[PDB]
Amino acid sequence: GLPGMQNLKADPEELFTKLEKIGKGSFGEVFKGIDNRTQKVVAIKIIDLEEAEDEIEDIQQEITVLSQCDSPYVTKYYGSYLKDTKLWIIMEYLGGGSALDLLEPGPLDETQIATILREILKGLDYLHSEKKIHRDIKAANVLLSEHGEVKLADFGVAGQLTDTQIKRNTFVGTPFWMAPEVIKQSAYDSKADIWSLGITAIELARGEPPHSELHPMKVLFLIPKNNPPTLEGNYSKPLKEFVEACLNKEPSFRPTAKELLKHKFILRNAKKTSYLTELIDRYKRWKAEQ
Ligand SMILES: N#Cc1cccc(-c2c[nH]c3ncnc(N4CCOCC4)c23)c1
Numbered sequence: 001g002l003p004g005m006q007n008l009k010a011d012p013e014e015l016f017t018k019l020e021k022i023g024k025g026s027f028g029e030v031f032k033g034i035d036n037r038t039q040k041v042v043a044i045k046i047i048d049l050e051e052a053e054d055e056i057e058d059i060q061q062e063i064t065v066l067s068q069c070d071s072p073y074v075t076k077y078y079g080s081y082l083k084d085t086k087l088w089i090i091m092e093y094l095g096g097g098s099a100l101d102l103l104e105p106g107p108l109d110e111t112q113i114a115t116i117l118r119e120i121l122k123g124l125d126y127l128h129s130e131k132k133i134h135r136d137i138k139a140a141n142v143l144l145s146e147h148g149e150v151k152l153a154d155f156g157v158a159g160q161l162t163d164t165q166i167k168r169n170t171f172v173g174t175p176f177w178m179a180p181e182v183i184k185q186s187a188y189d190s191k192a193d194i195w196s197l198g199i200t201a202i203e204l205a206r207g208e209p210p211h212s213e214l215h216p217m218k219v220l221f222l223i224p225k226n227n228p229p230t231l232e233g234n235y236s237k238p239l240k241e242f243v244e245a246c247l248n249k250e251p252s253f254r255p256t257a258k259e260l261l262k263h264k265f266i267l268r269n270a271k272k273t274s275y276l277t278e279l280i281d282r283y284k285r286w287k288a289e290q
């Protein structure tokens with residue numbers, strides 16, 4: 001039973017005008033689309049189910065997790081449609097670019113980094129309160145609306161905790177951002193997302209996560225072996241400390257998302273999300289001169 005799945009008589013090729021490919025998600029490509037009834041722009045992920053086996057279970061879970069989320073900090077889910085062998089997953093469209101794209105014209109300043117991290121933390125606090133774990137936190141999965149609103153996307157590997165299953169052990173995520181306990185498949189919880197947040201903070205400050213120049217297989221031994229990464233360069237002490245707070249090998253030593261919302265780096269530097277339009281405009285202009 002796939003949540004939000006619509007009637008098979010509903011033809012998504014009739015209900016939506018599929019436009020250009022905007023990227024990829026887990027299991028399929030993502031396209032920009034227009035909802036023909038409201039004229040609102042949507043993001044559509046298309047999965048060829050015939051081109052899949054033992055992935056439908058992971059596909060169902062992504063949809064279930066998305067459907068149970070109701071937050072200004074998480075991409076909205078508008079239902080699923082089956083067209084022959086292809087599943088159309090309709091999601092909220094965010095036109096501002098990902099935090100990673102916004103890094104292309106040049107570095108971010110600490111106000112921008114703090115603002116983005118604060119909104120990610122709002123999303124993480126929501127998910128964690130709902131006993132959900134995102135598991136793929138990185139700048140490419142942090143999307144902005146054209147107004148500067150920041151939301152979490154890519155629920156392809158998200159997990160659910162229950163009163164019976166208080167911890168997860170599955171190997172999921174993107175190597176460079178994965179927590180040591182996830183890579184070693186130890187019992188883990190929401191603290192794994194706090195480690196990925198620390199890596200994301202380095203990425204927002206430097207433009208790339210640690211070990212970015214290495215093969216992802218090398219990081220599978222390096223992350224559990226090495227001391228946790230630190231933020232190197234001329235960055236503020238509160239920013240380096242924020243990074244260090246997230247990047248502790250001991251998960252119980254990592255603060256919760258709610259606690260990090262009161263970190264001095266956030267409180268001293270974060271500003272209204274509306275200021276992020278300057279970053280969106282900077283990217284639009286840059287793109288136009290490439
Ligand atoms: N499954 C999933 C998935 C993963 C990551 C992001 C999104 C996504 C939702 N709304 C969007 N609006 C604008 N760009 C978006 N992305 C598409 C992926 O490439 C980058 C640009 C999205 C969906």
Ligand SMILES: [Mn+2]
Nearest residue numbers: 024025026154
């Ligand atoms: Mn992805």
